[PDB]
Design a binder for this molecule. Structure first.
Ligand SMILES: *[C@@H]1O[C@H](CO)[C@@H](O)[C@H](O)[C@H]1NC(C)=O
Ligand SMILES: *[C@@H]1O[C@H](CO)[C@@H](O)[C@H](O)[C@H]1NC(C)=O
Ligand SMILES: *[C@@H]1O[C@H](CO)[C@@H](O)[C@H](O)[C@H]1NC(C)=O
Ligand SMILES: *[C@@H]1O[C@H](CO)[C@@H](O)[C@H](O)[C@H]1NC(C)=O
Ligand SMILES: *[C@@H]1O[C@H](CO)[C@@H](O)[C@H](O)[C@H]1NC(C)=O
Ligand SMILES: *[C@@H]1O[C@H](CO)[C@@H](O)[C@H](O)[C@H]1NC(C)=O
Ligand SMILES: *[C@@H]1O[C@H](CO)[C@@H](O)[C@H](O)[C@H]1NC(C)=O
Ligand SMILES: *[C@@H]1O[C@H](CO)[C@@H](O)[C@H](O)[C@H]1NC(C)=O
Ligand SMILES: *[C@@H]1O[C@H](CO)[C@@H](O)[C@H](O)[C@H]1NC(C)=O
Ligand SMILES: *[C@@H]1O[C@H](CO)[C@@H](O)[C@H](O)[C@H]1NC(C)=O
Ligand SMILES: *[C@@H]1O[C@H](CO)[C@@H](O)[C@H](O)[C@H]1NC(C)=O
Ligand SMILES: *[C@@H]1O[C@H](CO)[C@@H](O)[C@H](O)[C@H]1NC(C)=O
Lengths: 312, 184, 387, 87, 48
């Protein structure tokens, strides 16, 4: 059975004087009577972005080594061909990772009002490389590599050990090895099929962020009780001795919109941080070893887990 | 503190300056703009404080759980009370926080060795009670999982599960028995 | 200093003199527009105003309404002496910079004792029964005294007004209906009544020839453009522009959109310019503004050195181009290590072998392989206690 | 941090000579843009006059500062004003 | 609910009293003050 967890949102950025004001000077001066405000805003957004980087860095970096799959696939009949990466692929992402990546899916105009977007520190290739290293370490060493140096061990013997940790004596596995391998392979087939046709937890994040950014962009089209929602128009139509009040009303409105957006972004960042902490603990307890906590590494008695990457 | 000196669109940043240099019937506007600006700045500060306090509450509850499951007892949660196997813990105080000392057992030096699931003695399949079979090339031995402490496969170090055929990788070795030597 | 060098920028932003290794922020790059294209249709006509104290107007009850179209304006300049000149919603002294829309000059005469009665939000007999101004008005009120003509030797008896009206007046509506108004019950006062124009009394007894010059801006394809001639047309640069009064800034490229001949411009999602029709070439164009960019500065720690490599985030370009953007002042190497100063998209700068700043793709750690077999196992023999 | 008039570091400033002992004498009419900085290496108090204004042609109120009579008058100067003591 | 009796610099905390005593073209300013403060109250609430 699978479990789906967001780990990071998209790193956003905004520049006030480019957003509230723009190709103007008197607007910049009138805003300068607050400037600590927008320093706070840019500081908070920078903090959120670097926090997202640290968050992914924390979840996916558990191994101080990089482990490679041995070329011989003699794992006692378990077919791991689906989850190990395939070199023949153009990219270095395995079959189920790619099938996940496909199920989840304007930019310029948003870029043209200060809303620049930053890229993640780790590229998807690097993330898939971490997941592949974790898979190879788990398969080839059991759980010791999470608490020391990786130690070789036959996979059948490791599975017998993981049985020994729930109350089922080894002879059960050593007698039903073929049956267990068949059930495992059939289960992997079923899961790849059931995902081959959901992932709401990974798409609500993107949709929420897109909707918030769109709402900001829409905000510039309102008057906030001025004569026109265009600073250039009001400047070309009206004189400095009187346009200042309408301009100031426009700053007040747009600044309010930025403030609300930053507050909601902070709250959602805290939520994602909590979710990623949960994901990190699930990683360190389920992947890097067997856990006896009920309903914390699956649904039932737990044996082992394999992590797969995803978009965000 | 810095937010006080800013004008917020009013002509000056001191209420005394406003009330002196201007008539209240025409200075109420400056007063009101300054009041609104300072209120909204205070609102932003309070919201920042609330979010920071929420984060600190999360960290504090994590620290409490770490104390109750690392200090007041050993924990089996891999990598929750250190990096390695956990033995015991030591808390220390700190300014606005706590600092822990996790005492983690870690094995360093390992050999090779060639292994097999079971032992075929007399047509009986012998499986280790709690240990693992290793081979020293010359013989087979049962040892504990984390230390090479090799011992003789006796009948109390193993248990039987029927015939040798079903298991794959079962090797043919003798199993020593105490009773027969003692009988005479 | 705060802005002479990137180091100065960092020190001024952080308010410190010893800057630690990392990446820090400064202002953002702006591409300044090189020139400004001026576009305007070739409008030769000059609107008539000497006719609009020429000889005679109408009174306020039936006020002279006139249209203006396809001509140029000029407020510096055939005319009449002017006691007052006032323009609501728009700067009176900035008018010739625009291309107006639907210009209407509202002409009549009115007594000097009621000059102040005409404004957007006035009340009283005049502005309620004879004329009416909307409350969102946009136009100019032009007034000047006329005693040369409209105050006769025996007094003037050519102009009339309505005293009291059963119904109010719609904004911009004329009242030309004369009837015995029923003040009480018992169905039947005459409305139209001569004023008191005589040059024998105070100036308020005199008529004031007042023209209300209302107008619109940028509501429909406009042809009331002011005296500014167009300029030539340049493309593919960050430029300023203007079209029929509109202003702006960006880069003007080719277009691919079809339009209908009753519109002027194209708006995007954020309600701002997306495409434009030239007023002379009558062709379609696209707008892609040039204001973009993010600036980042890298230092190995002021304690060590002072050579710094500036990063530009969304700029196409030791000038190295990256997914993170335009990086200037870094020696790109193939040799991969752990991250020292994180950049973005898997790049990290570092101060290594004088020595300089190198940018590279990070490493993920040492790469090894587990000697997996189905008949081998590694058993530890020693321990380490790690606190 | 402040926001005022300052000399940008490493400014390309002008250097004037008056060396006669060779036959160099010119202290031209320098316009006063906002802020002027003055570093002087002397031995004998060589600088003696400081005239400031806009036209200084007895057609506007002009400033007269020297090393201390400071008269705001409407002065009619000549083509090249200089001073001099005799030995 | 108690952030309804606040004036926000306006003369009447009730829109009825604003409208029945004041003309639309001189009452927008009173409405503007009232609406700004009521929106601010909503913003504080939803954040909490
Ligand atoms: C795993 O199953 C796939 C599905 O076709 C098959 O192609 C592959 O040969 C199998 N691998 C092993 C090791 O049997
Ligand atoms: C011991 O030798 C075997 C066979 O070459 C090998 O598989 C195993 O990795 C070696 N173990 C160690 C860690 O020395
Ligand atoms: C057992 O193996 C170790 C390590 O290879 C070796 O040093 C030792 O001599 C071996 N002993 C026997 C009984 O072969
Ligand atoms: C491992 O697999 C090979 C090939 O199937 C077999 O020859 C060998 O006996 C197996 N070893 C063990 C102990 O599982
Ligand atoms: C053990 O003995 C049985 C019966 O002779 C034989 O089938 C099996 O292959 C032997 N196994 C080994 C590991 O020698
Ligand atoms: C105005 O003059 C320009 C340049 O000769 C010409 O291209 C344009 O067609 C003329 N007419 C209009 C539509 O303004
Ligand atoms: C008409 O124009 C002339 C000069 O162009 C000017 O002297 C005169 O005052 C204007 N006439 C009127 C009646 O305003
Ligand atoms: C950093 O500063 C310390 C003194 O605070 C000094 O001892 C050390 O050499 C410095 N290292 C460099 C040059 O970065
Ligand atoms: C701009 O981008 C293209 C991408 O193919 C690149 O070849 C070119 O070097 C870049 N530099 C510029 C400014 O032309
Ligand atoms: C390595 O660095 C050089 C610049 O030193 C660059 O030209 C080249 O494209 C990079 N890639 C490789 C792997 O050659
Ligand atoms: C194990 O490592 C420790 C390091 O403190 C060392 O003192 C000890 O002698 C080593 N023992 C063996 C079995 O080599
Ligand atoms: C400005 O500075 C440069 C420094 O190389 C110098 O060569 C030049 O003569 C200076 N003068 C000017 C032109 O301002």
């Amino acid at each position: 059975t699978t479990e789906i967890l967001p780990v990071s949102m998209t790193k956003t950025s905004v520049d006030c004087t480019m957003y509230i004001c723009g190709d103007s000077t008197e607007c910049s001066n009138l805003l300068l009577q607050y400037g600590s405000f927008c320093t706070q805003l840019n500081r908070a957004l920078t903090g959120i972005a670097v926090e997202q980087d640290k968050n992914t860095q924390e979840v996916f970096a558990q191994v101080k080594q990089i482990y490679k799959t041995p070329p011989i696939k003699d794992f006692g009949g378990f077919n791991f061909s689906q989850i190990l990466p395939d070199p023949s692929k153009p990219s270095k992402r395995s079959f189920i990772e790619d099938l996940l990546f496909n199920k989840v899916t304007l930019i310029c105009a948003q870029k043209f009002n200060g809303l620049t977007v930053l890229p993640p520190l780790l590229t998807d290739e690097m993330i898939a490389q971490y997941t592949s290293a974790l898979l190879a370490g788990t398969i080839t060493s059991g759980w010791t590599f999470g608490a020391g140096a990786a130690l070789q061990i036959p996979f059948a013997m490791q599975m017998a050990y993981r049985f020994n940790g729930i109350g089922v004596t080894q002879n059960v596995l050593y007698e039903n090895q073929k049956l267990i391998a068949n059930q495992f392979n059939s289960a992997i087939g079923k899961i790849q099929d059931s995902l081959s046709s959901a992932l709401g937890k990974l798409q609500d994040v993107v949709n929420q962020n897109a909707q918030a950014l769109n709402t900001l962009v829409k905000q510039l089209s309102s008057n906030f009780g001025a004569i026109s929602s265009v600073l250039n128009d009001i400047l070309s139509r009206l004189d400095p001795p009187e346009a200042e009040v309408q301009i100031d009303r426009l700053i007040t409105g747009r600044l309010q919109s930025l403030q609300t957006y930053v507050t909601q972004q902070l709250i959602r960042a805290a939520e994602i941080r909590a979710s990623a902490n949960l994901a990190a603990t699930k990683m360190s307890e389920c992947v890097l070893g067997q856990s006896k906590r009920v309903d914390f590494c699956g649904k039932g008695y737990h044996l082992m887990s394999f992590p797969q990457s995803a978009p965000h | 503190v810095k937010q006080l000196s800013s004008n917020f669109g009013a002509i000056s940043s001191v209420l005394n300056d406003i009330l002196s240099r201007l008539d209240p019937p025409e200075a109420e506007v400056q007063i009101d703009r300054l009041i609104t600006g300072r209120l909204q700045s205070l609102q932003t500060y309070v919201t920042q404080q609330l979010i920071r306090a929420a984060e600190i509450r999360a960290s504090a509850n994590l620290a409490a759980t770490k104390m109750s499951e690392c200090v007041l007892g050993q924990s089996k949660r891999v990598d929750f009370c250190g990096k390695g196997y956990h033995l015991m813990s030591f808390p220390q105080s700190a300014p606005h926080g706590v600092v822990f000392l996790h005492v983690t057992y870690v094995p360093a030096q390992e050999k090779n060795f060639t292994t097999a699931p079971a032992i075929c003695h007399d047509g009986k399949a012998h499986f280790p009670r709690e240990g693992v079979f290793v081979s020293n090339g010359t013989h087979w031995f049962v040892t504990q999982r984390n230390f090479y402490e090799p011992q003789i496969i006796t009948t109390d170090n193993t248990f039987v599960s029927g015939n040798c055929d079903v298991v794959i990788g079962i090797v043919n070795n003798t199993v020593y028995d105490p009773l027969q030597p003692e009988l005479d | 200093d705060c802005a002479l060098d990137p180091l100065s920028e960092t020190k001024c932003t952080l308010k410190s003199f010893t800057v630690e290794k990392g990446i820090y922020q400064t202002s953002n790059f702006r591409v300044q527009p090189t020139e400004s294209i001026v576009r305007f249709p070739n409008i030769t006509n000059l609107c008539p105003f000497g006719e609009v104290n020429a000889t005679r107007f109408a009174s306020v009850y039936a006020w002279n309404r006139k249209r203006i179209s396809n001509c140029v304006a000029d407020y510096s300049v055939n005319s009449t002496s002017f006691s007052t000149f006032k323009c609501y919603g728009v700067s009176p002294t900035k008018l010739n910079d625009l291309c107006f829309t639907n210009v209407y000059a509202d002409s009549f005469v009115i007594r000097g004792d009621e000059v102040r009665q005409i404004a957007p939000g006035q009340t009283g007999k005049i502005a309620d029964y004879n004329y009416k101004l909307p409350d969102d008005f946009t136009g100019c009120v032009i007034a000047w005294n006329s005693n040369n003509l409209d105050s006769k030797v025996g007094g003037n008896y050519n102009y009339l007004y309505r005293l009291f009206r059963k119904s109010n007046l719609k904004p911009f509506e004329r009242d030309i209906s004369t009837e015995i108004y029923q003040a009480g019950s018992t169905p039947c006062y005459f409305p139209l009544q001569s004023y008191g124009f005589q040059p024998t009394n105070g100036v308020g007894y005199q008529p004031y020839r007042v023209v209300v010059l209302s107008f619109e801006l940028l509501h429909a394809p406009a042809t009331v453009c002011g005296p500014k001639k167009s300029t030539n047309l340049v493309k593919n640069k960050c430029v300023n522009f203007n079209f029929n009064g509109l202003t702006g800034t960006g880069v003007l490229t080719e277009s691919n959109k079809k339009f209908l001949p009753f519109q002027q411009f194209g708006r995007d999602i954020a309600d701002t310019t997306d495409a434009v029709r030239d007023p002379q070439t009558l062709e379609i164009l696209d707008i892609t503004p040039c204001s973009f960019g993010g600036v980042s500065v890298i230092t190995p720690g002021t304690n060590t050195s002072n050579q710094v490599a500036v990063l530009y985030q969304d700029v196409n370009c030791n000038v190295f181009q990256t997914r993170a953007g335009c990086l200037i002042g870094a020696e790109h190497v193939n040799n991969s290590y752990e991250c020292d100063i994180p950049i973005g998209a898997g790049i990290c700068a570092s101060y290594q072998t004088s020595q300089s700043i190198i940018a590279y793709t990070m490493s993920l750690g040492a790469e090894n392989s587990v000697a997996y077999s189905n008949n081998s196992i590694a058993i530890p023999t020693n321990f380490t206690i790690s606190v | 941090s402040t926001q005022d008039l300052f000399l940008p570091f490493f400014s390309n400033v002008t250097w004037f000579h008056a060396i006669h002992v060779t036959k160099r004498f010119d202290n031209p009419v320098l316009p006063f843009n906002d802020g002027v900085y003055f570093a002087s290496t002397e031995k004998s108090n060589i600088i003696r006059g400081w005239i400031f204004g806009t036209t200084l042609d007895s057609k506007t109120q002009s400033l007269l500062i020297v090393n201390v009579v400071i008269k705001v008058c409407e002065f009619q100067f000549c083509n090249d004003p200089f001073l001099g003591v005799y030995y």
